[PDB]
Amino acid sequence: VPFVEDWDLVQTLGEGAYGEVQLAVNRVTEEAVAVKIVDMKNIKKEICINKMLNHENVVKFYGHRREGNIQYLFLEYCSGGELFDRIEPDIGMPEPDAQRFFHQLMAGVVYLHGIGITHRDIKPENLLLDERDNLKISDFGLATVFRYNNRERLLNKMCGTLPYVAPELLKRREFHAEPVDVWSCGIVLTAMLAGELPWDQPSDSCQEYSDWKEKKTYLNPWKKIDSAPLALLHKILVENPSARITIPDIKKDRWYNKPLKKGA
Numbered sequence: 071v072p073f074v075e076d077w078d079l080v081q082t083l084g085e086g087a088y089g090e091v092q093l094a095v096n097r098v099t100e101e102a103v104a105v106k107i108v109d110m111k112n113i114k115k116e117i118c119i120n121k122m123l124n125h126e127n128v129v130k131f132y133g134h135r136r137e138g139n140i141q142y143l144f145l146e147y148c149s150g151g152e153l154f155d156r157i158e159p160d161i162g163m164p165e166p167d168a169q170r171f172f173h174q175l176m177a178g179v180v181y182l183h184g185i186g187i188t189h190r191d192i193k194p195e196n197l198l199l200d201e202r203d204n205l206k207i208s209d210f211g212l213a214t215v216f217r218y219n220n221r222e223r224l225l226n227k228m229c230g231t232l233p234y235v236a237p238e239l240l241k242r243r244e245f246h247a248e249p250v251d252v253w254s255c256g257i258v259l260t261a262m263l264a265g266e267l268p269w270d271q272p273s274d275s276c277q278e279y280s281d282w283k284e285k286k287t288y289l290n291p292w293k294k295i296d297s298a299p300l301a302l303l304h305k306i307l308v309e310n311p312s313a314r315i316t317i318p319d320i321k322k323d324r325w326y327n328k329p330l331k332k333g334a
């Protein structure tokens with residue numbers, strides 16, 4: 071079929087350090103894809119990790135091409151945009167939506183962790199929604215292998231985004247990958263339920279973080295959150311990463327299993 075490899079770029083979807091992401095539409099089929107365009111003047115690793123990924127809650131990778139100094143990643147277009155834009159400032163979103171989004175997020179992270187990949191920068195700006203509002207984990211530019219040949223490697227690079235990063239990343243030279251991703255998922259949950267982030271960063275020098283360690287949940291954001299999801303947050307946002315709830319145990323949590331939401 072003539073012309074089937076032609077794509078028109080129609081709209082910018084995001085424009086950061088890497089470069090930009092465009093919406094592309096096929097000339098013949100009108101299929102939509104996102105094209106991540108990165109000027110090489112690291113992404114090799116992003117591409118490599120993207121090649122390993124196949125899951126309903128992870129943004130699908132279709133292929134890549136390099137023309138001179140530009141690398142072009144061809145990726146799943148998520149027409150719902152970012153989770154970020156479903157969070158009303160100071161309010162959040164209805165608890166049943168947040169629970170469904172949280173379930174999907176967990177399914178995506180379980181998958182990643184199971185293939186030995188940590189994302190390292192989970193946040194609402196990176197969590198995309200498809201036309202059916204299914205959540206998809208995007209942007210593996212900071213991601214890395216933490217398990218290979220069934221052997222764990224400890225991380226040491228500080229990366230991520232400060233309000234979402236776990237406290238051990240600021241305190242310890244080395245740390246386990248999985249608890250850091252669990253922590254960031256807890257901050258995402260807080261944001262969905264309160265429409266605000268609890269602190270600038272999880273440091274002993276940050277007053278809001280201290281108030282949380284002192285269990286002052288009569289303060290915001292925590293007073294906005296129902297006791298059931300709040301009990302889960304108490305198990306996720308635990309300073310000692312060895313004492314922090316694991317994902318198999320999040321799946322046993324009372325709120326995680328509470329019926330809330332009707333089908334579409």
Ligand SMILES: N#Cc1cc2c(cn1)[nH]c1ncc(-c3ccc(CN4CCCCC4)cc3)cc12
Nearest residue numbers: 082083084091104145146147148151152208209
């Ligand atoms: N990294 C990355 C990445 C980013 C995306 C992707 C695959 N990978 N697939 C995607 N599908 C849709 C959007 C997206 C993000 C935000 C919006 C909303 N708005 C943002 C500002 C510019 C206009 C669109 C719309 C679409 C972003 C992506």
